[PDB]
Amino acid sequence: ITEAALVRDILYVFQGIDGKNIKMNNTENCYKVEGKANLSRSLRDTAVRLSELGWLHNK
């Protein structure tokens, strides 16, 4: 995985269309990031902070 991939997937997740790697819909209420990438900071940890912008759109 790379930072760029996560920027475009987020640009779809700001609407409700799933990415390739941020792929969880609002069902258990948060867009769970996925994959064997490690690299916590941007990946596991920042993307979830942004995805709430999308959770508020689906509703």
């Binding site: 475009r8 997937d9 779809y12 269309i17 799933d18 990415g19 390739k20």
Partner: protein, 100 residues
């Protein structure tokens, strides 16, 4: 789809029996209804290997066909144009985020 021929048959007989006080309503030639005329919709590359940016760049021109009723190259209109609304056949190997 076909039954409009029968509806027009019932109708024109009824316009005649309303106009039993007259005669000689106009009617169109059958080619006006038989020809495709003004109706809407009717070897491509391995799009699974065509990369994500270009894959959008290929799909976005097909929408510019499909928005006027032309069968695109991906995302092509279905048969059974009947009932009351269309459905379309966007491919199983296009990227899921683009398909949605």
């Amino acid at each position: 789809l076909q039954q409009s021929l029968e509806l027009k048959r019932k109708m024109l007989r009824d316009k005649q029996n309303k106009k039993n006080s007259g005669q000689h309503l106009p009617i169109f030639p059958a080619w006006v209804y038989e020809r495709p005329a003004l109706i809407g919709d009717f070897t491509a590359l391995p799009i699974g290997t065509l990369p994500l940016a270009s894959q959008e760049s290929a799909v976005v021109e097909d929408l510019l066909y499909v928005l006027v009723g032309v069968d695109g190259r991906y995302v092509s209109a279905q048969p059974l144009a009947g009932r009351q609304s269309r459905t379309f056949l966007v491919d199983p190997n296009l990227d899921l985020s683009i398909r949605e």
